[PDB]
Design a protein around this nucleic acid. Structure first.
Ligand SMILES: Nc1ncnc2c1ncn2[C@H]1CC[C@@H](COP(=O)(O)OP(=O)(O)OP(=O)(O)O)O1
Ligand code: SF4
Lengths: 261, 1140, 258, 259
DNA sequence: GAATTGGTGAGGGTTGGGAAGTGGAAGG
DNA sequence: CCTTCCACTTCCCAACCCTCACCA
C-alpha cells in the first residue's frame, strides 16, 4: 500500500489546479521517501517536475516503491469537493487499480470518500544537467504573474534580458511595443516582498508566452518564485512549498539560424 | 343500390359517346383486323345475362388514321391463405356466405419466397377468390381484412383464414401482367361474335410505329398588377397551339387591341413552326371556336406544360362563366388527385418528365430553361407584369411570345419525350398517363411484378410501418440508417498540365507494377476487350517500352513533371455490384432459416457473408422510464377531433397520435434529466446472402442493364459515324448522326435513372420486397473499392478528389498512358488500351471478384454449377487540361463536392456544386464565380495565375466599396436580390424564424393572404441596415415595396425601419453594403486566397485578410527564432510505459 | 378587488425565482385565507405546492375567490426591478386582465408601478394527499446545496439511505463512486447549524439528482430545509418562510428495473 | 514635444472603458488648454464630447497644438496593464509615428513602458450647441443606471416626465407597462443621495433605451449624473471628472409624431 | 391512397460553460 | 480597520438545429 495525509488540501488543490491545464495525463513515482512526478507536454516544448517530500505530509507510509498513471482532469474533478479547511487522506494498494481519497471535516461532522480510477501511460524521461545558472532572480510571485499576463496581451513572445543593473522583459506586436523593468530592491522589509538578482554574467533569451501563462498558475503556492537561466539553454522556474518540496517548470528557448548557418 | 348501378351505366354510356364523338368506333361486327394499341381503361360491361361485369377497353389506331375500341371482360381476383387442410371448408363457407357476391373460388399451389426449405421445390396451396365486379371485391375485403388480425396476435371457418394477398393490386394492371397485353405494339384482333372472348395477339415484324395526331396548347391571360391572376376576374387574351407541325392562334378582341395575322416562326431550321391565326370577337366565341376546332381535329395525345396548375383551372372557369361545360364538350375533368384527364385521349405534362427524368437542376426546371438546355436556342421573354400593357400597345409581340411558347412545348415533347415514354411503356403494363405520372419506385415495382408473376411467385403484402421500436438495450430509437457514400478532399488549389509540379513516390510500388505488366495486360485484353491474347500480333513489343518506362521511374521517384489529369471511375457501379455479388432483397437470411434449409450441408459454398455499417440515433431515456411514461398515460385525456366534440381519452387515440405524444413527452423528460437529447451510435454488422435463392430480381436488373447498354452501344456506333462524318465534313450525315447521338444519349440517361431506382427502391416505405441490409452492403462494398484505389494512386501519385464512383487524380508525365495492340482479325485490327485502367482493374479482379456464383443446372436435378463473375470495371476520361478546387475557411477542413475541370479543347468541361448552379443564390456570387473559373485558364505560372485571378475579384470588391456608384439605377434591384423560394404554406412552419418566412409575413402584411394562400410561394428580398442591432432576419425587405405606390412605400418602410427620420427612402441608403461585402469576402476567400496560402504563394489579394489563425501560422513560418524541442537540449534517459 | 401589501417584499422575488426554472406558468389562486398554488412540471415527475397566508401580509383584502394565469418568466423580470428593501403591493380586479404591482422604498423617495398582462390558464388539480412520512429530516440549506452540487459532477442519480445513525448520500458514475455521511450530531449551538433526523424504519431510495439542482435554488428562502422519505412515495422538500407560509416540492423516485 | 503626467490611472482607464462601446478610432486634439475630443458614434445616433483640462495633470508640456489619430481598442488593451494607483505619463515627439505610455508603481519599484502606432485620422464636426434648458435634473448615478436597466428589461424605450413634485419614467412593451417616480428630496444631507430638479417648464420626451444603456457605462466615473433636457432639442447626459474635465453625450428624441 | 436512398454546403438562430470583475462577510 | 475568499452576474465563443438544393 501507499497511504498519506495532509494538513490542508489547499496545497494539493493548488497543485492539481496548476498541473491540470498544462499536462493532460501523467504518472507519479511513489516511495517511502516521498512522491515525485516528471512529465512533458505532448508538444514536447516544455517540461514539469514535482517533488513532495514524505516529511512534509502529516502522516506518511509506503509499503513498496510503485508508480501509477492518472488522468489529471479526472482527479481534479473530485478534489473540487474538498473544502479549504478539510483534512485529506490518500490510499492505494499494490494491485494498483484505484486511488482512494477521503476528506474529513476539522470537526469530524462529516466524511467524504471517493475512488478515482487509474490509467496506462507511456513517457520519455529526460535527464537534468544540474548545472549552475549564469543568472538567477527571485521575485514576488504575483508580480511575475501579472508581468506575464500583461506582456501576453502585448505579444506572442517575451524577450528576457538579465544584467547587473536589473532585469527587463520586452515584447512587440503589430500594435507596437512593451517593456517592463525591475531592479534590486534596496530597502527590504522582508525577502518575501523583495526582488533579488544574482549573476555570473548577463544573459539574453526569448520564450513563447503561452507556456509562461500556464506556469504562473502556481502563484497561490508561494509568495515568491525563482527563475534560473544560462545562455542558449532551457529556462527553469521554480515554486517551493516549505513543507512539501518543489515544483519546477522547464522551457527550451528559441534560437537563431545563424548558429547553424 | 340499383340507382348507383344505373349511374355507373350512365357514366359508362357518357364516356362511350364521348370517345365515339372523337371517332373511336367500338368493334361491333365479327371479323379480324390489325392495329396498334395506344391506350386503355377499365370499364364494366353487360354480359349475355345483362349482368354488369368488369372489362378493359383497349384503344387501337392504324396507319390510315382509322381508330377503334375493343372491350375484353376479365374477372378481378386475389388470394387467401388457410390453415392446414381447411381450404375446402373455408371455400364452402365463403361460397354459401357470399353467393352471388363472388364469381369463383379455387385452390392453386404457389411458391412463396418466405417458405422454409423452399429450394427443395416446396409450395403451398393458396385459394383464389374471383368476383364479377370490383365493388364486390372491395366489399368482401372490407368484411374479411379486420377479422384476420386476431390470428396474427394470438399466434367459424373465417378463423381459419390466416392471411390474404394481392387484394390491393390495381385491377387493370392485373390484365396486362397476366395476359401479356402491352402498349405500343401491333396486334391482330379477331372477334368471333358475342358468344366468345376476343382474341388479341402481337405481331412482332411491324417494327415501325404509326403516328398518332398530337396537339399541344398554351394560353395567356390578364391579371392584376404586381399580383397573381384570378380566374373569376381575369380573362384569356390568346390561346396558342400546334397539331402535327401546324400552328394556330386564337385572340380575343374584347382585350387584344388589334387583329393578329398569320406568321411563321423558326429558331432553328428543324423547327418549321408555321402558325395560322384566327381572330374571334369575344371570350365565349374564342372558347367555342377552340372547342369546335379540337372536336374537328380530334387529337389522341394532348400536351401542356404545368397545365394542371394554371391553364386548366383558368379555362374551365372562363368556359363555365359562359356556360360552356368543358367536361361535356371536350371530356376533361379534374381527377380526385387534381389532375385533368380525359376518356378519349392521353394527357402528357412535359414538366413531370423534366422534373423526374431530365437530370437538370431545379434552377432549370422552368420551361424557358429546359428549352434552352435541351433545344439549344434562346426562347423569347415577356415581363409578366407588362403583358397587360403589351396586349393593349403591341398585340403582335404578345402573339409572338405565345407562339414561341407553343413551339417550344411541342418540339420539346416531340424530340425527348415521345420516343422515351412509349419505349418504356413497351415493358411496363401501365398507360402512358401513369408511366409518366407515377413515381419511379412504383414503375420498378411493376417491372418486378411482371417477372414475379411469370415466375409464378405470390407477392408479399406491402411492408407495414413501425413506430418507436427499441434498441435491444432498451433505448428508444429515433432514427435508423446505413452509412452512405464515402467522400474525401485530399488536396487544394490548382493543377495544370501546362506547368511544372512536384511529385514524390515509393519505388517499391513501381517495382511491384513492373513485376506484373504482362499479367495485367493479358487480363485487360482478354476479359475486358474480349480479344484473345493469341490473336494479337505485337504483344511482346509494347511490353518492353512499358517495362523500361517503369524502370526509368523506379530509378528516380522524386521529381518535377507535368501532371496528367485523369478521372478513373467505375461504370454503372451499383447495378454492377448488385450483379457481381448477386444481391437480392429476398436473399438475406438469418442463421435459423439456413438451419431450416436442406442445402445447409457442411462445406456447402452457398453462404456468402458481407459487412456493412449501421447507424442509429436513440434518446437516452431508460426502457423503465418509458414504461413509467406509458403507465402515466394510462389516464391522460386529449382534445377532440373537432371543436364540437367531447375530449378523447388517450386509449381512444390512434397509434399514429399516441406514438407522437409519447415521443414528445419523453423528449421533454430527456431534455430535463439527461442533457444530451439524442445519442448517435455507429456499429458494424455482418449479414449472410444466400446464393441459391431464385434470381428473378437480379435477372430483371440484368435485362434492364443490357437494354441501357443497347442504347449505349448504338450511341457508340453512331458516335463512330459522327466522328467520321465530322472528320470528312459531311454536313447532312453529321446532322443526322448528331440527332441519333442526342436521342440515344438522352435515352441512356433516362434509363440510368430508372436502372438506379432498383437500388433505392429496396428502402422505400411499404415496398413489397423491402430490406435495409442490401442497401448498406452495396454502399460499403463501394467504399472499399474506392479506398483501395486511393491507396494505390497515393503510392504512385496524388489523388485530388473522391466520390462514390471514382477518383480524380494527377499522374506523372512518364506514366505508360495509352497503347495500340494490333490484330490479324480485320473485325478488330486495332485494340486501344489505357494502362491506368488495367492497373486499377486488376485489384478488383484479385480481391473483389466473386468466386461463389451459383446457377441451377437442371430444375429436376436440384443440382447447380459454381461459377465466378465480375462486371466492375474502371474506365478513364480525359486527360484534362486544368483542375481547380476550393478550400475551407476553417482550419483543418476541406470543401468536398465543389470543383471545376476543363477539357483539353480549352473550354469548360465540368463545374460542380458552385453557387452558379444553385437556384437563386445571390447573383453577384454567380457572376464572380463564373468569371474567375474562366480566368484560371490565363497565365503560365502560379505567380501569374493567382496575380491574374485576383484581378477579377478585385474589380467586384471595388464595385462594392464604390457602392456601385456607376452601376445603372435598375441593375442593383436584380444584382443584389436574393430569390430564396419557399416550399410549404406559411402556416405550416409554425414559429420557426428564417429570412424566407420573415419576408413572406412581411409581404402578407402588405398584400394579404391572397399570396400566402397556397404552397410554393416565391420571395425576393434585400437585407437592410437601419434597424441597427436587430438580428439579421428582422431587416429583410421584399423587393415588391420598390414598385408599390409611393405613399404606401413611405408607410411600410417607415414602419419597418422604425424611422420617419430616414430622409431618403433610397435602396442605396437602405442597403447593408458591409453585409454584402462580407458575403463576397467569403466567396473570394474560399477560392482565391486560402487556396493560395496553401500553395506556398503569398496572399494575392491585399483587400481581404486571411483568418487570424492562418495569419499567425503563416507569420510564425516567417521568422528566424525557431522553436526548439526540449528533446534537443536535454538527454533522453529512456522510454517508460506504465501498467495498472 | 384583490389587494395585498407585504413588508418583507424580497420574499416574492425569492419564492418566484425558486420556480422560474421549474415551472414556466401557472394559474395563481387567491382567496380570503391567502394566495395559493398547486402545479406540476411538464415532465410530470414532480409537484409544487405554494401558500402564503393572508395573516402574514401588512394588508389584505379579498372579496371573491380569484384565479389568474401568469407566466413566471414575466413576473421574474418585473421583480428584478424591486430591491430587497422595498415593500410590495399587489392588486387585481375580477373585471380586468392585468395585474398591478407597486414598489415602495423605505426612504420614501422612490416608488414604482408595474402592470403585466394576465393569461388564460386552467388546470385540473389534485390536493396532495395526507402522508405519514416514515422518515423526516431537517438540515441547514447550504449543506444540502453543496451535497447535491458536488455529487452532480460524479453522476446523475443519487442513492440516499437512512438509518438509526443518520443519513448517507451515495453516487456512482464513469469517474467512480463516492459517499457522504451525516450522522445525528450530539449537540448544537443553534438550529441553523444543526441536523435532526427521525426514522421509523430504515429506507433507501434512488432520486434523479439533476432535478434537485432546481429545488436547491430555494436556498435563500430559509436557513434550514425539511425533507421527508417513505417507500414508494414522493420525497418531500419543504421550505417555510418564517411563520407566514410554505413552499414544498414533491418528487417521485426513479422506478428501478427490478 | 508633448508629454503629460498624472498620479491617477483610474480616470484614464475608465474613460477608455466608457468610449470602447461607442467609438473605435478617434482623433484627439491637444493644446495648452488640455486634451479634447468630440466624435459621432459609429451608428451616428449620438455624439460624444469629452475634455480634460491641462490643470488636472501633475505636469504638462505642449510646445504646439496638434491632433493625433489613435485606435481605441488598442489603447484600451494597453491601458489595462496599469494598476489603478500607478503613475501615468504620456509622451510623443513632434514627428513621432508613435505614442509612448509609461506606468510606474507608486514605490518606483517597477517601471512599464509601451508604444502604440499612430494613424492618420480627420473628422468633420460642428461647434457643439448649448442652451438654457427647460429641465435640469441631478441624480445619484447608480440609481439612474439601475432604473434605466430595469426599464430596458420591460421595453425598448423610456419616456421621461418632469414636474415640480418629482421626476417620472414610463415604458411599455410586450411585457406590459411600467411607471416609476423619484420624489424631490425633503432635505439634502449630502448630494450622494440627493435628487434635485430645476424646472423652467414641464417636459415629456422619449428616447431609445439602448443608447442610454450605453451612456450609463461611465457610471464608475462619478457618483452623480446630470440630465439636461428641453423639447425639440437634443437631450444631453453629463458626467464630470474631478474638476479638470467633463464627458457628455448628445441624443435626439424619438419623435412621437410618427405615431 | 401514394411514397427510391445518404452525404454535404451555406446561412441564421439558440443554448452551455468558462473567464472576468465587483461587492459583502470573515479573519487577524 | 484592512485584505482575501466566496458568491453572483455579465460577456464571449463553440456547438447544434432548421431550411433548401446538389452530388452521388
Ligand atoms: N438517382 C440515384 N439514386 C440512388 N443512388 C444513385 C442515384 N444516382 C447515383 N446513385 C449512386 C449509386 C450509383 C452511383 C453513381 O454511379 P452510377 O451507377 O449512377 O453511374 P455514373 O458514373 O453516374 O454513370 P455511368 O458510368 O453508369 O454511365 O451513385
Ligand atoms: S444460404 Fe444455403 S443454407 Fe442458407 S438458406 Fe440459402 S441455400 Fe439454405
Amino acid at each position: 500500500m501507499f497511504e498519506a495525509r495532509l494538513v490542508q488540501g489547499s496545497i494539493l488543490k493548488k497543485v492539481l489546479e496548476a498541473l491540470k491545464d498544462l499536462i493532460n495525463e501523467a504518472c507519479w513515482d511513489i516511495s517511502s521517501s516521498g512522491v515525485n512526478l516528471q512529465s512533458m507536454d505532448s508538444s514536447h516544448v516544455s517540461l514539469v517536475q514535482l517533488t513532495l517530500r514524505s516529511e512534509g505530509f502529516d502522516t506518511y507510509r509506503c509499503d513498496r516503491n510503485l508508480a501509477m498513471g492518472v488522468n489529471l482532469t479526472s482527479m481534479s474533478k473530485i478534489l473540487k469537493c474538498a473544502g479549504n479547511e478539510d483534512i485529506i487522506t490518500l490510499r492505494a494498494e499494490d494491485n494498483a487499480d484505484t486511488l482512494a481519497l477521503v476528506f474529513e471535516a476539522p470537526n469530524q461532522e462529516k466524511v467524504s470518500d471517493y475512488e478515482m480510477k487509474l490509467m496506462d501511460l507511456d513517457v520519455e524521461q529526460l535527464g537534468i544537467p544540474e548545472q549552475e545558472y549564469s543568472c538567477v532572480v527571485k521575485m514576488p510571485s504575483g508580480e511575475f504573474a501579472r508581468i506575464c499576463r500583461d506582456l501576453s496581451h502585448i505579444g506572442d513572445a517575451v524577450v528576457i534580458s538579465c544584467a547587473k543593473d536589473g532585469v527587463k522583459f520586452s515584447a512587440s506586436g503589430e500594435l507596437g511595443n512593451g517593456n517592463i523593468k525591475l531592479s534590486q530592491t534596496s530597502n527590504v522589509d522582508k525577502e518575501e516582498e523583495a526582488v533579488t538578482i544574482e549573476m555570473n554574467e548577463p544573459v539574453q533569451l526569448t520564450f513563447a508566452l503561452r507556456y509562461l501563462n500556464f506556469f504562473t498558475k502556481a502563484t497561490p503556492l508561494s509568495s515568491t518564485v525563482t527563475l534560473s537561466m544560462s545562455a542558449d539553454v532551457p529556462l527553469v522556474v521554480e515554486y517551493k512549498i516549505a513543507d512539501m518540496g518543489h515544483l519546477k517548470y522547464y522551457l527550451a528557448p528559441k534560437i537563431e539560424d545563424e548558429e547553424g548557418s | 343500390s340499383s340507382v348507383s348501378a344505373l349511374k355507373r351505366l350512365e357514366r359508362s354510356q357518357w364516356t362511350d359517346k364521348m370517345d365515339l364523338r372523337f371517332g373511336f368506333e367500338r368493334l361491333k361486327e365479327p371479323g379480324e383486323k390489325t392495329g396498334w394499341l395506344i391506350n386503355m381503361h377499365p370499364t364494366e360491361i353487360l354480359d349475355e345475362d345483362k349482368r354488369l361485369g368488369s372489362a378493359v377497353d383497349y384503344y387501337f389506331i392504324q396507319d390510315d388514321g382509322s381508330r377503334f375500341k375493343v372491350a375484353l371482360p376479365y374477372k378481378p381476383y386475389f388470394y387467401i391463405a388457410t390453415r392446414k387442410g381447411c381450404e375446402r371448408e373455408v371455400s364452402s363457407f365463403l361460397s354459401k356466405k357470399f353467393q352471388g357476391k363472388i364469381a369463383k373460388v379455387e385452390t392453386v399451389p404457389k411458391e412463396d419466397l418466405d417458405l422454409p426449405n423452399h429450394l427443395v421445390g416446396l409450395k403451398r396451396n393458396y385459394i383464389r377468390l374471383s368476383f364479377h365486379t370490383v365493388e364486390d371485391l372491395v366489399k368482401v375485403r372490407k368484411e374479411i381484412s379486420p377479422a384476420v388480425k386476431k390470428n396474427r396476435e394470438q399466434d367459424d371457418q373465417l378463423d381459419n383464414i390466416v392471411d390474404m394477398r394481392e387484394y390491393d393490386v390495381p385491377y387493370h394492371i392485373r390484365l396486362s401482367i397476366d395476359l401479356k397485353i402491352h402498349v405500343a405494339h401491333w396486334y391482330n384482333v379477331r372477334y368471333r361474335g358475342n358468344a366468345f372472348p376476343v382474341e388479341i395477339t402481337r405481331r412482332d415484324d411491324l417494327v415501325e410505329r404509326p403516328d398518332p395526331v398530337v396537339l399541344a396548347f398554351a394560353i395567356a391571360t390578364t391579371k392584376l398588377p404586381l399580383k397573381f391572376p384570378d380566374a373569376e376576374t381575369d380573362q384569356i387574351m390568346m390561346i396558342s397551339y400546334m397539331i402535327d407541325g401546324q400552328g394556330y392562334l386564337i385572340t380575343n378582341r374584347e382585350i387584344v387591341s388589334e387583329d393578329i395575322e398569320d406568321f411563321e416562326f423558326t429558331p432553328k431550321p428543324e423547327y418549321e413552326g408555321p402558325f395560322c391565326v384566327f381572330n374571334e370577337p369575344d371570350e365565349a366565341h374564342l372558347i367555342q371556336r377552340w372547342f369546335e376546332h379540337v372536336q374537328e381535329t380530334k387529337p389522341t395525345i394532348m400536351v401542356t406544360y404545368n397545365g394542371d396548375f394554371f391553364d386548366w383551372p383558368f379555362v374551365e372557369a372562363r368556359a363555365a362563366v359562359h356556360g360552356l361545360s368543358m367536361q361535356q364538350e371536350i371530356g376533361f375533368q379534374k381527377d380526385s388527385q387534381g389532375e385533368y384527364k380525359a376518356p378519349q385521349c392521353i394527357h402528357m405534362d412535359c414538366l413531370r418528365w423534366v422534373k423526374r427524368d431530365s437530370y437538370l437542376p431545379v434552377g432549370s426546371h422552368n420551361l424557358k430553361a429546359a428549352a434552352k438546355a435541351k433545344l439549344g436556342y434562346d426562347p423569347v421573354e415577356l415581363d409578366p407584369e407588362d403583358m397587360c400593357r403589351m396586349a393593349t400597345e403591341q398585340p403582335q409581340t404578345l402573339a409572338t411570345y405565345s407562339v414561341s411558347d407553343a413551339v417550344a412545348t411541342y418540339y420539346l415533347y416531340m424530340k425527348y419525350v415521345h420516343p422515351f415514354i412509349f419505349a418504356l411503356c413497351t415493358i411496363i403494363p401501365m398507360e402512358p398517363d401513369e408511366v409518366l405520372r407515377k413515381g419511379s419506385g412504383t414503375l420498378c415495382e411493376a417491372l418486378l411484378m411482371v417477372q414475379a408473376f411469370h415466375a409464378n411467385i405470390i407477392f408479399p403484402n406491402k411492408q407495414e410501418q413501425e413506430f418507436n421500436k427499441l434498441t435491444d438495450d432498451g433505448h428508444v430509437l429515433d432514427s435508423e440508417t446505413y452509412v452512405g457514400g464515402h467522400v474525401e478532399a485530399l488536396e487544394s488549389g490548382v493543377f495544370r498540365s501546362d506547368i511544372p509540379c512536384r511529385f514524390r513516390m515509393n519505388p517499391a510500388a513501381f517495382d511491384f507494377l513492373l513485376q506484373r505488366v504482362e499479367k495485367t495486360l493479358r487480363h485487360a485484353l482478354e476479359e475486358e476487350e474480349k480479344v484473345p491474347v493469341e490473336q494479337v500480333t505485337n504483344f511482346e513489343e509494347v511490353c518492353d517500352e512499358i517495362k523500361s518506362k517503369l524502370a526509368s521511374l523506379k530509378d528516380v521517384p522524386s521529381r518535377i513533371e507535368c501532371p496528367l489529369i485523369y478521372h478513373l471511375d467505375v461504370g454503372a457501379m451499383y447495378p454492377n455490384i448488385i450483379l457481381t455479388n448477386r444481391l437480392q432483397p429476398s436473399a438475406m437470411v438469418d442463421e435459423a432459416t439456413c438451419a431450416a434449409c436442406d442445402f445447409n450441408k457442411p462445406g456447402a459454398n452457398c453462404q456468402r457473408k458481407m459487412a456493412w455499417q449501421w447507424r442509429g440515433e436513440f434518446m437516452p431515456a431508460s426502457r423503465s422510464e418509458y414504461h413509467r411514461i406509458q403507465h402515466q398515460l394510462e389516464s391522460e385525456k386529449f382534445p377532440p377531433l373537432f371543436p364540437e366534440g367531447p375530449a378523447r381519452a388517450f386509449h381512444e387515440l390512434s397509434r399514429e397520435e399516441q406514438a407522437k405524444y409519447e415521443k414528445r413527452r419523453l423528449a421533454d423528460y430527456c431534455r430535463k434529466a439527461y442533457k444530451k437529447i439524442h445519442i448517435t451510435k455507429v456499429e458494424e454488422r455482418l449479414t449472410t446472402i444466400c446464393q441459391r435463392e431464385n434470381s428473378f430480381y437480379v435477372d430483371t436488373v440484368r435485362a434492364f442493364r443490357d437494354r441501357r447498354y443497347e442504347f449505349k452501344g448504338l450511341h457508340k456506333v453512331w458516335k463512330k459515324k459522327l466522328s467520321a462524318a465530322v472528320e470528312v465534313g459531311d454536313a447532312a450525315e453529321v446532322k443526322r448522326c448528331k440527332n441519333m447521338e442526342v436521342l440515344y444519349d438522352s435515352l441512356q440517361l433516362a434509363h440510368k435513372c430508372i436502372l438506379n431506382s432498383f437500388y433505392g427502391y429496396v428502402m422505400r416505405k411499404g415496398a413489397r420486397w423491402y430490406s435495409m441490409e442490401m442497401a448498406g452492403i452495396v454502399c460499403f462494398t463501394g467504399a472499399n473499392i474506392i479506398t483501395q484505389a486511393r491507396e494505390l494512386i497515393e503510392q504512385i501519385g496524388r489523388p485530388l478528389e473522391l466520390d462514390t464512383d471514382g477518383i480524380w487524380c494527377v499522374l506523372p508525365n512518364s506514366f505508360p498512358e495509352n497503347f495500340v495492340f494490333k490484330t490479324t482479325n480485320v473485325k478488330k485490327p486495332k485494340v486501344t488500351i489505357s494502362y491506368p485502367g488495367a492497373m486499377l482493374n486488376i485489384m478488383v479482379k484479385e480481391g473483389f471478384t466473386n468466386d461463389q456464383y451459383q446457377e441451377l443446372a437442371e430444375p429436376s436435378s436440384l443440382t447447380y454449377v459454381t461459377r465466378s463473375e465480375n462486371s466492375i470495371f474502371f474506365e478513364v476520361d480525359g486527360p484534362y487540361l486544368a483542375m481547380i478546387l476550393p478550400a475551407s475557411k476553417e482550419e483543418g477542413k476541406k470543401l468536398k463536392k465543389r470543383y471545376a475541370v476543363f477539357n483539353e479543347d480549352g473550354s469548360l468541361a465540368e463545374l460542380k456544386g458552385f453557387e452558379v448552379k444553385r437556384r437563386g443564390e445571390l447573383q453577384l456570387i454567380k457572376i464572380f464565380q463564373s468569371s474567375v473559373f474562366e480566368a484560371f485558364l490565363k497565365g503560365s505560372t502560379l505567380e501569374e495565375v493567382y496575380g491574374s485571378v485576383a484581378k477579377v475579384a478585385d474589380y467586384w470588391l471595388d464595385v462594392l466599396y464604390s457602392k456601385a456608384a456607376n452601376m445603372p439605377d435598375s441593375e442593383l434591384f436584380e444584382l443584389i436580390s436574393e430569390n430564396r423560394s419557399m416550399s410549404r404554406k406559411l402556416e405550416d412552419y409554425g414559429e420557426q424564424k428564417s429570412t424566407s418566412i420573415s419576408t413572406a409575413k412581411r409581404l402578407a402584411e402588405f398584400l394579404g393572404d391572397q399570396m400566402v394562400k397556397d404552397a410554393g410561394l416565391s420571395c425576393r428580398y434585400i437585407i437592410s441596415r437601419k434597424p441597427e442591432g436587430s438580428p439579421v432576419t428582422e431587416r429583410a425587405i421584399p423587393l415588391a415595396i420598390f414598385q408599390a405606390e409611393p405613399t404606401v412605400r413611405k408607410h411600410f418602410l417607415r414602419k419597418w425601419l422604425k424611422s420617419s427620420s430616414l430622409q431618403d427612402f433610397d435602396i442605396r441608403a437602405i442597403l447593408d453594403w458591409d453585409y454584402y461585402i462580407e458575403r463576397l469576402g467569403s466567396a473570394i476567400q474560399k477560392i482565391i486566397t486560402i487556396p493560395a496560402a496553401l500553395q506556398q504563394v503569398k496572399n494575392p489579394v491585399p483587400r481581404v485578410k486571411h483568418p487570424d489563425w492562418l495569419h499567425k501560422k503563416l507569420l510564425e513560418k516567417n521568422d528566424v527564432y525557431k522553436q526548439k524541442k526540449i528533446s534537443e537540449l536535454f538527454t533522453l534517459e529512456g522510454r517508460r510505459q506504465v501498467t495498472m
